[PDB]
Design a protein around this ligand. Structure first.
Ligand SMILES: *[C@H](C)[C@H]1/C(=C/c2[nH]c(/C=C3N=C(/C=C4\NC(=O)C(CC)=C4C)C(C)=C\3CCC(=O)O)c(CCC(=O)O)c2C)NC(=O)[C@@H]1C
Ligand SMILES: *[C@H](C)[C@H]1/C(=C/c2[nH]c(/C=C3N=C(/C=C4\NC(=O)C(CC)=C4C)C(C)=C\3CCC(=O)O)c(CCC(=O)O)c2C)NC(=O)[C@@H]1C
Ligand SMILES: *[C@H](C)[C@H]1/C(=C/c2[nH]c(/C=C3N=C(/C=C4\NC(=O)C(CC)=C4C)C(C)=C\3CCC(=O)O)c(CCC(=O)O)c2C)NC(=O)[C@@H]1C
Ligand SMILES: *[C@H](C)[C@H]1/C(=C/c2[nH]c(/C=C3N=C(/C=C4\NC(=O)C(CC)=C4C)C(C)=C\3CCC(=O)O)c(CCC(=O)O)c2C)NC(=O)[C@@H]1C
Ligand SMILES: *[C@H](C)[C@H]1/C(=C/c2[nH]c(/C=C3N=C(/C=C4\NC(=O)C(CC)=C4C)C(C)=C\3CCC(=O)O)c(CCC(=O)O)c2C)NC(=O)[C@@H]1C
Ligand SMILES: *[C@H](C)[C@H]1/C(=C/c2[nH]c(/C=C3N=C(/C=C4\NC(=O)C(CC)=C4C)C(C)=C\3CCC(=O)O)c(CCC(=O)O)c2C)NC(=O)[C@@H]1C
Ligand SMILES: *[C@H](C)[C@H]1/C(=C/c2[nH]c(/C=C3N=C(/C=C4\NC(=O)C(CC)=C4C)C(C)=C\3CCC(=O)O)c(CCC(=O)O)c2C)NC(=O)[C@@H]1C
Ligand SMILES: *[C@H](C)[C@H]1/C(=C/c2[nH]c(/C=C3N=C(/C=C4\NC(=O)C(CC)=C4C)C(C)=C\3CCC(=O)O)c(CCC(=O)O)c2C)NC(=O)[C@@H]1C
Ligand SMILES: *[C@H](C)[C@H]1/C(=C/c2[nH]c(/C=C3N=C(/C=C4\NC(=O)C(CC)=C4C)C(C)=C\3CCC(=O)O)c(CCC(=O)O)c2C)NC(=O)[C@@H]1C
Ligand SMILES: CCC1=C(C)/C(=C/C2=NC(=C\c3[nH]c(/C=C4\NC(=O)[C@H](C)[C@H]4CC)c(C)c3CCC(=O)O)/C(CCC(=O)O)=C2C)NC1=O
Lengths: 169, 149, 99, 67, 160, 161, 161, 160, 161, 160, 160
């Protein structure tokens, strides 16, 4: 995996350049954001399980059929597996928030998601809907909390949405 | 397997293909190739799969058989994904960057071009019958045989 | 799809750019048939521009894999393609002692 | 099947060709009935003038047997 | 979007964006506020516009809810209004983006073949689209009514 | 290709709901940046060939690449290298206008690596040339639009990586 | 494709040098061999079908290959094999005329091994048939021209096997 | 090369070389001694031809070498003379081959694009090649000069 | 894998015949060449590192490949290229000893092109490096064994292409 | 004409014009008044622009009007000024139409061949067009001058 | 600076800053961003701008670079280019300051006397600055070109 600093370093090493003023500026921006990154990660760690439970309790009301017959969370086994996927999404989103880069997100989440979910027959739309529900809950809780900077939180979840979402248009 | 433990969603198809008894017959490494392809961008490959690209030989629709020596290399090709094709003629003549040069002919850089440039024999009544040595008919015979080829 | 791809390569000298062309000819094949797929490929404006009413089609574009197969063998491989070509020069002492 | 014998004159508009172009400049061809509409559309879009059109094969108003 | 359409045309011609295309994008980015207002009005009148248009369509064509009709039954009527909502959302996306492409790709290309399988009357759905258009125009200001009506009529023509 | 607006609309469509406040925020942010994007695109379009000339002079001219034995040696290959730089500049302009690298993935970085490998194109040389293009464009357009363009230019370079 | 002249010119061009003494000597040698090459090409063009017929009779006919279950069983397969041998002989003649195997690599051997592997064509049987063609051509053309044709036919055999 | 062109044509019609093509190849092979002599002459007198043609071209078109011109400056003039030397080498390659194929492949495809990018006047480069042709024609008899004039005129026509 | 002995034995066995005079002549030829094969193998084993070193210095070093952005930039990538050359030299020696290019086909070529295509490795440049290895091995072993080694090196190159 | 191009594209795709195409058409018609004003300024100042640009071009390249040159003599100078007037009129046509289509159709296709036939230097023609562009831009407002600069530069680039 | 001019005008009447002068100051501060964009474009393009303008000048007025001219010789040409660079830098200062006062104070007071002393044609210097104006205005949008044209025209007027 690569965080923002490592991805910048790799980008500059690609051209074989020394770290210039723009590199220093990007590094300074990340290093100043690091306080809010750690704060948001601590908050999401504090409220993790509750966040995923509430996100599922909203998503199964948005699309009720995932718990009715022929739905993909019908059994308690399927329900627990779905909640496990949601917890995985939250944990890797937290890792990506701390790292300030979505490559750790890609290498360990998205790179085969459609293949695995298609093989298991899991829908690929409700999952991103639940992802966005988690992101909304996370950002609402952050806004309620004393987090001066919270814009970066939408980046990991939105990248997950863009990658794992079917290209509708 | 899938039920024995937790399966990471990064080597799903790879391990699915590996566990089956047909594993020792796919000789092409399906693990290193996909692991590199994740970090690399989209490959030079047909939209619907690697097996869907015929060999670039003179004749014969030689395709990689999906079941014989398994070498399928699926890639996520969306709709609006134009391919990069190397022009036979001059590189400047590629219609991607030279859209008005489609009719250009590849002089000495591409394959030969066949046209009905010469008048077909018997086109006009100027050759009033006879004329067994009416010169332009080998050209049209070569044109027809070249269209066949 | 393999048949349509080979047909396109054969009747325009060009591999299909991708899913847009493949979808067009694929809908043609599903709706009308082989004859209409061939008719569509022949009557496409790209065919008209590349070849008039008097030009036989020819191979106009090559995939990178095919180009590599053609021009990467030990024969037909240029000296300067993927190699550092050092300009050979006679030794300076040989030139000095040369009459 | 019904066939159309069409004579037309299609000029060039973009480039000054230096190869013999009279054959596709003024010509007559036997296009099928099922292709006549699209051929006419192509000639019009290219800017040609349809000098003449005749029904070389078949007869007008054939309800059945036009194959 | 308008940007994507201009970029695609410029790419196909193998050129940079025209000065006219750039000016069109300039005007669009300036009028983004008004188009956002139009989309927000549509989203506000979502559950009312579709309901009224469906009511008018039912009163125009009883056969759809009559015996032997495509949408016989409350479930079929609810799904018909679901298609109504989907087309209204598509129109919202289209007015926001300044291009019909988001409308067409999601819900216009091959729509006749998609609804032939279901047996629904294509002209009936076009009439429903029309009725939604009049409802939106009624609940919309004058000029932006015309702006959205352009896209609504485009969908109407392409589907009908 | 998907611009910022099409990206937002796609993210909303795949969820089936209407553009809520976040979508409008993203749309208005893109519209606010649109003036700068359009200015930079128009300036680059006007000075398209000069930028390529400056980049080629800064990177490849009077080097082993352009000397005999180099891939940029023959006149046809020089013209092809110039055309490739034109592609990169035009598609960077496209990605700047669209706020996305989706066009770069779909059309530019799609098969490009093995395309150059089969052709024998020097990857490091083309990377340095794209860097020169990026710096020349930054100089000609300004720090902000220069960095915006450099985002897509560095995306292309990292794709070549 | 490259003949001997084009190969020498490309070797000079890659180093950016005028044709020196060694290149002139190579060109002189090719010009000396040109008459023999032309005579052999004319002889082979005259006896094209006869050479293939004799080779197939010597190496393939009256064997499991032609009998049922062999690759050359059906009339269609026999015709295909004869056509392949004709192509090999013609392209070997081209290579002998040009003094170079570039045409063989570019238009014959590219993917030929993969083609036979997919089709099930017996590579050893094809190599033996080409060897028979080489012997027949040697007997029909002479010693030096036969040796050159054998060089290019063995090039084809090496590429195939 | 005439041999390569004939082989390519015979391959395109998928047939052995015609007796006429073989006769033409044999004629070229026999006549190669004159081609080698012309190439040797050009190679030996390359520096003199390049220098004289450069001086004549500079006198004919002073602006290209005066300040503000493309070739102004000692190093720019050195590069201009290097270009002329490159084209002389290409002409020698074409003379040896007996065909303009090497010249077109190496220094005539995309020449207009290359020189337009560089800012060098393409007609000025053509005039330089014309001066080189005149000097070379003076440095040899009518027959050899007449032969080399074909390639010189081919390059000039492509540049023009 | 298969050497000359096993190859001829299998060729006889597949059609079910005993070893005739023709096969015995092939085995006699292999036994005649065995001494030269063993000497060449000993020489190459002695000079394995030097051969790859000289080939890399003669083809790859100071090119676009080693510079930043090239496929031999990082030290790990350089060591990987060296390891690939070591494989090619060692397996060429194996095939030279065995008198058959079957170990190359079943342990170096079947899928290697796919792996390089996935990894972005330049096949043309690796072919050039293998050609340099061939030249160095020929210079170090002699024309007779050098040609035999070059046969299998070219086999590897053709398989890669 | 943008209208012509949109109609041609619509026919080629076999459908009515897109809403975006209609938006482009209406915007072009809106700007037609300013385009007509620019054309009126150019047609009013045709004489002064022609004379001034011709004199500047003659000063830049007196050889063209010098004896033995193509433009030497009163008749040749008159024809050179006639060509200048023709190209200025073509630029006016382009500014009115909003596109370089009329200029390309009337006086920008085969121009290289026609001037090679007449012996006129295409470099001199391009420089003359540049001088006309400079004179017109000086005589016209910056924004209008910038608009006409597109057609002037298109003509110049097609010349060179 | 506009701030300087407004503060000076206020002090000359001994009053605090008038509402009109504060309005002018606010407008200047608001337009400062565009000012810096123009200035940064100019400074980034200083090499290309100076080179192209010098080439245009040395083509239009070969007398100054011919023997017996002030700019004749390598050193004199370099010094002419250095003066062009000086005036471009002063143009950048004026662009940043929103007026021409820095250009006046540094390189437009006594310029006529200085160039008379050095033997330079002030009309030639003005022509060089005009070409710099054209080259720079070719490297920016319509509004920015018109903005920089004011400083360029001021230098032209002060020199001629
Ligand atoms: C309480 C007295 C009764 C009750 C209520 C209740 N259930 C849920 C939620 C769920 N119940 C199920 C049921 C099952 N899963 C299985 O695998 C089986 C098969 C044996 C059963 C019966 C499931 C899947 C859910 C989750 C999805 C959902 O929302 O229905 C709730 C809601 C809890 C919440 O909102 O978080 C409530 C109130 N369940 C009982 O068993 C009692 C009879
Ligand atoms: C919940 C939001 C949705 C849902 C979930 C669901 N998932 C599965 C099974 C699996 N999910 C995954 C996913 C991942 N594994 C990973 O390692 C990663 C990243 C760390 C991801 C995202 C995998 C691999 C499986 C199978 C293997 C496993 O779980 O160990 C199921 C099971 C379905 C069944 O019938 O067994 C379910 C139900 N289902 C819904 O309806 C929601 C929309
Ligand atoms: C429907 C039952 C399920 C489903 C299918 C689905 N497929 C596509 C797209 C394509 N399917 C094909 C099919 C074939 N190619 C062949 O060569 C053959 C016959 C030999 C077949 C059957 C192809 C070529 C495509 C691509 C079409 C195109 O390029 O436009 C889609 C749509 C994909 C898209 O993005 O448009 C779908 C939905 N999907 C399901 O979930 C169903 C279970
Ligand atoms: C010049 C002396 C006269 C003249 C010329 C003129 N010609 C055309 C158009 C065409 N000319 C031809 C003629 C030929 N094409 C051939 O291939 C051959 C046989 C080898 C000949 C004789 C053709 C076919 C055309 C059609 C267009 C085309 O060239 O493809 C034009 C008009 C061109 C146009 O598109 O408008 C003109 C002006 N005009 C005169 O007034 C002179 C008397
Ligand atoms: C220049 C910076 C480098 C360079 C360039 C170079 N390229 C070619 C040939 C081709 N380049 C491309 C690339 C593209 N085509 C596309 O459509 C796009 C995406 C939109 C790209 C990036 C292609 C396809 C070709 C082949 C011809 C064709 O365009 O169809 C060459 C010539 C190679 C030859 O042997 O002719 C060269 C020299 N060379 C350098 O050294 C620079 C680093
Ligand atoms: C004859 C010595 C052996 C033999 C031949 C054989 N070949 C085929 C079929 C094909 N052969 C080719 C070969 C080529 N295509 C090319 O473009 C070139 C490059 C110059 C070559 C050499 C191809 C493509 C085919 C496919 C069929 C076709 O003709 O299009 C067959 C028949 C295969 C079948 O089942 O139809 C045969 C019999 N067979 C032997 O046993 C001989 C040793
Ligand atoms: C002299 C008669 C004209 C002239 C020459 C000139 N050329 C350059 C720069 C280059 N010229 C070339 C051309 C070629 N390279 C090749 O390999 C071949 C094919 C065999 C050709 C024709 C190239 C590639 C360059 C780029 C620089 C480099 O070689 O590395 C210059 C300098 C341009 C500059 O500003 O750097 C000049 C002056 N100029 C004239 O005005 C004459 C008409
Ligand atoms: C200097 C302290 C020591 C030394 C240096 C030396 N190195 C070379 C040649 C090369 N060095 C490298 C190393 C790297 N390239 C990379 O990309 C990386 C990481 C960024 C490293 C470490 C390489 C690849 C080469 C090969 C040539 C090339 O760069 O393309 C030499 C020359 C060797 C020769 O004979 O050519 C030298 C002298 N030598 C010493 O004695 C010092 C201890
Ligand atoms: C003046 C800037 C340049 C110049 C002019 C020049 N032109 C001619 C002769 C002709 N010019 C044309 C061109 C056109 N006629 C048209 O109708 C149009 C369509 C838009 C164009 C462009 C033609 C056809 C002629 C032939 C005579 C005629 O007009 O009937 C000359 C005279 C050439 C001679 O030798 O008689 C001259 C001098 N010459 C320059 O050097 C300037 C660059
Ligand atoms: C199943 C389809 C099929 C066909 C058609 C076929 C034909 C066939 N006939 C052959 C030979 C032959 N065939 C004939 C037969 C004839 N002589 C005449 O005068 C008659 C006209 C004709 C029989 C009526 C002869 C004489 C030969 C030997 C040719 C020679 O040895 O030169 C051979 C080559 C020798 C061999 O059989 O191995 C083939 C392949 N084989 C097949 O598998």
């Amino acid at each position: 995996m690569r965080d923002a600093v490592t991805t910048l370093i790799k980008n500059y090493d690609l051209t074989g350049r020394y770290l210039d003023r723009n590199a220093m500026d990007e590094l300074k921006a990340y290093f100043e954001s690091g306080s809010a990154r750690i704060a948001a990660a601590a908050m999401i760690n504090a409220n993790s399980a509750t966040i995923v439970k509430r996100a599922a309790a909203q998503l199964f009301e948005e699309i009720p059929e995932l718990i009715r017959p022929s739905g993909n969370a019908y059994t308690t086994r399927r329900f627990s597996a779905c909640l496990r996927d949601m917890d995985y999404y939250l944990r890797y989103a937290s890792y990506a928030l701390i790292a300030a880069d979505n490559n750790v997100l890609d290498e360990r989440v998205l790179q085969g998601l459609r293949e695995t979910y298609n093989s298991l027959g899991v829908p690929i739309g409700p999952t991103v809907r639940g992802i966005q529900i988690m992101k909304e809950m996370i950002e609402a809780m952050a806004e309620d909390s004393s987090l001066n900077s919270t814009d970066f939180i939408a980046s990991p979840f939105d990248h997950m949405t863009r990658e794992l979402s079917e290209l509708s248009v | 397997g899938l039920g024995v433990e937790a399966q990471e969603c990064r080597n799903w198809g790879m391990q699915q293909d590996l566990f089956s008894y047909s594993a020792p017959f796919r000789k092409v490494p399906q693990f290193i190739t996909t692991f590199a392809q994740y970090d690399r961008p989209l490959p030079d490959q047909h939209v619907y799969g690697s097996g869907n690209d015929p060999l670039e030989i003179q004749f014969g629709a030689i395709f990689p058989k999906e079941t014989r020596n398994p070498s399928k290399r699926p890639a996520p090709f969306n709709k609006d994904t134009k391919r990069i094709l190397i022009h036979r003629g001059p590189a400047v003549n590629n219609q991607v960057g030279n859209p008005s040069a489609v009719g250009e002919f590849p002089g000495s850089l591409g394959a030969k071009v066949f046209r009905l440039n010469g008048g077909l024999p018997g086109a006009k009544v100027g050759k009033n019958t006879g004329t067994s040595v009416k010169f332009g008919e080998s050209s049209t015979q070569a044109l027809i045989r070249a269209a066949y080829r | 799809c393999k048949a349509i791809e080979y047909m396109h390569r054969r009747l325009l000298g060009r591999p299909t750019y991708g899913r847009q062309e493949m979808n067009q000819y694929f809908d043609i094949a599903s709706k009308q048939g082989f004859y209409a797929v061939v008719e569509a490929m022949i009557d496409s404006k790209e065919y008209s521009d590349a070849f008039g009413e008097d030009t036989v089609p020819y191979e106009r574009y090559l995939t990178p894999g095919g180009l590599q197969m053609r021009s990467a063998r030990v024969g037909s491989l240029r000296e300067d393609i993927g190699q550092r070509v050092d300009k050979e020069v006679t030794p300076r002492f040989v030139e000095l002692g040369q009459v | 099947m019904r066939m159309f014998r069409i004579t037309a004159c299609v000029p060039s508009q973009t480039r000054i060709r230096t190869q013999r172009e009279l054959q596709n400049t003024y010509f007559t061809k036997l296009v099928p009935y099922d292709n006549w509409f699209r051929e006419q559309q192509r000639i019009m879009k290219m800017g040609g003038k349809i000098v003449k059109v005749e029904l070389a094969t078949g007869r007008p108003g054939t309800n059945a047997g036009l194959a | 979007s308008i940007v994507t359409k201009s970029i695609v045309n410029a790419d196909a011609e193998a050129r940079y964006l025209s000065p006219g295309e750039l000016d069109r994008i300039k005007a669009f980015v300036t009028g983004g506020a008004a188009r956002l207002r139009i989309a927000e009005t549509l989203t506000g009148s979502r559950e009312t516009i579709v309901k009224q248009a469906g009511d008018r369509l039912f009163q125009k064509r009883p056969d759809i809810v009559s015996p032997g009709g495509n949408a016989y039954g409350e479930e079929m009527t609810a799904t018909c209004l679901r298609d109504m909502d989907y087309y209204l959302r598509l129109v919202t996306y289209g007015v926001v983006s300044g291009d019909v492409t988001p409308i067409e790709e999601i819900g216009l290309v091959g729509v006749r073949e998609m609804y032939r399988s279901l047996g629904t009357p294509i002209e009936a759905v076009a009439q429903s689209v029309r009725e939604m258009k009049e409802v939106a125009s009624g609940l919309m200001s004058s000029d932006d009514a015309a702006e959205a009506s352009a896209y609504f009529d485009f969908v109407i023509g392409k589907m009908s | 290709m998907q611009d910022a607006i099409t990206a937002v609309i796609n993210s909303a469509d795949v969820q089936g709901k209407y553009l809520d406040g976040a979508a409008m925020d993203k749309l208005k942010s893109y519209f606010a940046s649109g003036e700068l994007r359009v200015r930079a695109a128009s300036v680059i379009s006007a000075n398209a060939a000069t930028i390529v000339k400056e980049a080629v002079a800064k990177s490849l001219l009077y080097s082993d690449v352009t000397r005999p034995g180099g891939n940029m040696y023959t006149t046809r290959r020089y013209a092809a290298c110039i055309r490739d730089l034109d592609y990169y500049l035009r598609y960077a302009t496209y990605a700047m206008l669209a706020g996305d690298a989706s066009i770069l993935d779909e059309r530019v970085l799609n098969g490009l690596k093995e395309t150059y490998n089969s052709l024998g194109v020097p990857i490091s040389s083309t990377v340095q040339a794209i860097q020169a293009i990026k710096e020349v464009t930054a100089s000609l357009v300004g720090a902000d639009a220069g960095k915006e363009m450099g985002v897509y230019l560095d995306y292309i370079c990292s794709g070549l990586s």
